[PDB]
Write a protein that binds this ligand. Structure first.
Ligand SMILES: *[C@@H]1O[C@H](CO)[C@@H](O[C@@H]2O[C@H](CO)[C@@H](O)[C@H](O)[C@@H]2O)[C@H](O)[C@H]1NC(C)=O
Ligand SMILES: *[C@@H]1O[C@H](CO)[C@@H](O)[C@H](O)[C@H]1NC(C)=O
Lengths: 49, 48
């Protein structure tokens, strides 16, 4: 709440339970390789509920 | 013949084959393998 961002992107997608642990900078799997790959120098947050 | 086998042994006796004198095209690595974990450590799988 004390930071200013030039722009903010909210990527939304429903995925399975293990694939939550999958989504992270520098990971592997059928989702992190062919479906959604977070860049290595990621600056942001992931939210899974 | 490391991926067309039928009795991949239990972990207590980890079968260890030796692959020498050959041309390693890992496209056949990919074909017999609906992958779930290709975590490579020393090398990158793309540059293999
Ligand atoms: C691990 O399993 C491999 C596949 O079953 C074996 O490779 C083959 O084994 C057969 C005999 O089952 C040989 O006839 C063939 O030439 C090839 O080597 C491999 O031997 C085996 N290794 C160990 C240590 O068990
Ligand atoms: C095993 O060998 C048979 C031989 O016909 C082939 O049809 C099959 O696809 C092979 N399976 C794997 C997992 O290598």
């Amino acid at each position: 709440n004390d930071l200013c961002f030039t722009n903010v992107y909210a990527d939304s997608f429903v995925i399975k339970g293990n694939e939550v642990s999958q989504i992270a900078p520098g990971q592997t799997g059928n989702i992190a390789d062919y479906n959604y790959k977070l860049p290595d120098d990621f600056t942001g947050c992931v939210i899974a509920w | 013949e490391v991926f067309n086998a039928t009795r991949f042994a239990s972990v207590y006796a980890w079968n260890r084959t030796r692959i020498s004198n050959c041309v390693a095209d890992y496209s056949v690595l990919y074909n017999f393998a609906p992958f779930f974990a290709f975590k490579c450590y020393g090398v990158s799988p793309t540059k293999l």
